[PDB]
Amino acid sequence: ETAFVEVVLFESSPNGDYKTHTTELQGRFSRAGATISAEGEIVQMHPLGLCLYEYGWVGVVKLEQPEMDPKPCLTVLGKAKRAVQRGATAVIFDVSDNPDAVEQLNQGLEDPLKRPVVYMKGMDAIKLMNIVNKQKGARARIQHR
Amino acid sequence: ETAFVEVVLFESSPNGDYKTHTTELQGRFSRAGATISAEGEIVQMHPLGLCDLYEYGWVGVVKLEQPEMDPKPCLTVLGKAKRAVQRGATAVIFDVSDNPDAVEQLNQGLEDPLKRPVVYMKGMDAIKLMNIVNKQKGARARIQHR
């Protein structure tokens, strides 16, 4: 099922009102996690960063070439789990560089997380990084329709 | 339609992890805002307080006054919802227990709906909501369309 991800940039206009810009993106809900909507501020994690942020962040993790990390500290599902335990309301992996991560997550072996675990690639990941990379405050609204 | 609201208390466990306690509550989405999901930190707002910056993305909770308490209200209850979004609310949850007439007003159809959810809660759920909000600091609201 498709995860409709809205990524919102924001600047507090001087008087308290917010100026925002929204970009709508898409990934899929993995079997590894729940298929629910979720939302919160984006934290960009390095994939090795998962071996205190305020509760309810949306982890964004750009996975790396499998041959960069030969004996990885955890499985990609393990990494997501650790994120949640550390207060993530959702995890979005950019699997552009680790396309086999997908089959690994959808392997349906452990029963799922109660939070979403979304995978993104191609154009949408590029845009997700285009935004994340440049702006401190960005918000993710992950929507199951 | 029903708004399925999970309120989550939380505090850090001594090792980086979070200990949490979750409470599932219900309200309805009103025609004044979308019927979508939304999540964020609760900010309890006095109803007269929509007439100081908050981190974008908060879920405002507003317990409405007995109508005879506010004779000259700065805004319609939809106006306060709308003002809250503009100040970075991701959703508004009104406790309507003391002002049941606000429901009919919120569902009026007259103005465009907000792109954010505007939920109302009453009776028991709202009690349970304020029970958590008034005591607990560090409360996250997850509002869910199913």
Numbering used by the authors:
A (entry chain B): 30 to 80, 88 to 181
B (entry chain A): 30 to 80, 87 to 181
What did the published study say regarding this structure?
A disulphide bridge, conserved across species, links two structurally elaborate loops, β3–β4 and β4–αA. The crystal structures for apo xZNRF3ecto, zZNRF3ecto and mZNRF3ecto showed no major differences in the main chain conformation. All but two of these crystal structures reveal an extensive interface (average interface area 992±109 Å2) formed between two ZNRF3ecto polypeptide chains. The interaction is twofold symmetric; strands β3 and β7 of the ‘subunits’ abut face-to-face at the core of the dimer.
Rspo (R-spondin, also roof plate-specific spondin) proteins are evolutionarily conserved from fish to humans and have well-documented roles in a broad range of developmental and physiological processes resulting from enhancement of canonical and non-canonical Wnt signalling. ZNRF3/RNF43 specifically targets these Wnt receptors for ubiquitination and turnover, hence reducing Wnt signalling responses. Direct extracellular interaction with Rspo proteins inhibits ZNRF3/RNF43 activity. Here we report a molecular level analysis of the ZNRF3/RNF43 ectodomain structure and its interactions with Rspo proteins.
